[PDB]
Design a protein around this ligand. Structure first.
Ligand code: HEM
Length: 153
């Protein structure tokens, strides 16, 4: 469970992200795909992209980055009281998109890295640890739903 002080660190940096949701979403997805190419293969929508320049040029990838970060921002702003938001996300991710929990770990690392690059003054070690806790809570709760459905592994 995050403390109130930890949530304030998380949401303080997240308010900075929302100034340029789309640029963050591009950086995060591109980092994810570069660092962990097995993740790109899960997207029929994106798997034609073969270079970082092609990824950066894709408007559809930019659009999806906004979809992803909007859903995550709505979850973070619930400060843990996010059941209604995770149900459908866990359902689609386990049963339709077939995304292992480990890949959620990967994108969590990408999110932390991009926040650090873009917001160093609001993403010192205290805020990095708090955001890591928030993303762990997200993964923990999604993993419980995956396990319910027979997908935790
Ligand atoms: C912070 C973590 C993530 C969030 C908040 C998120 C959010 C979303 C949302 C809101 C959608 C559209 C609605 C839906 O299908 O549920 C979606 C679609 C999808 N996501 Fe996730 N996602 C995350 C992580 C991942 C990861 C790590 C992968 C793959 C490695 C992935 C793969 C997909 C795929 C394949 C789709 C369908 C894309 C399409 O063809 O339209 N997601 N995601």
């Amino acid at each position: 469970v995050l403390s109130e002080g930890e949530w304030q660190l998380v949401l303080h940096v997240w308010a900075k992200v929302e100034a340029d949701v789309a640029g963050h979403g591009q950086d995060i997805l591109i980092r994810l795909f570069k660092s962990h190419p097995e993740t790109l293969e899960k997207f029929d929508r994106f798997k034609h992209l073969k270079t970082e320049a092609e990824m950066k040029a894709s408007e559809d990838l930019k659009k999806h980055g906004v979809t992803v970060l909007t859903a995550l921002g709505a979850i973070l702003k619930k400060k843990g009281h996010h059941e209604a938001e995770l149900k459908p996300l866990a359902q689609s991710h386990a049963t339709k998109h077939k995304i292992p929990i480990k890949y959620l770990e990967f994108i969590s690392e990408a999110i932390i890295h991009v926040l650090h690059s873009r917001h160093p003054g609001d993403f010192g070690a205290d805020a990095q640890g708090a955001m890591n806790k928030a993303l762990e809570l997200f993964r923990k709760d999604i993993a419980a739903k995956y396990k319910e459905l027979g997908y935790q592994g």
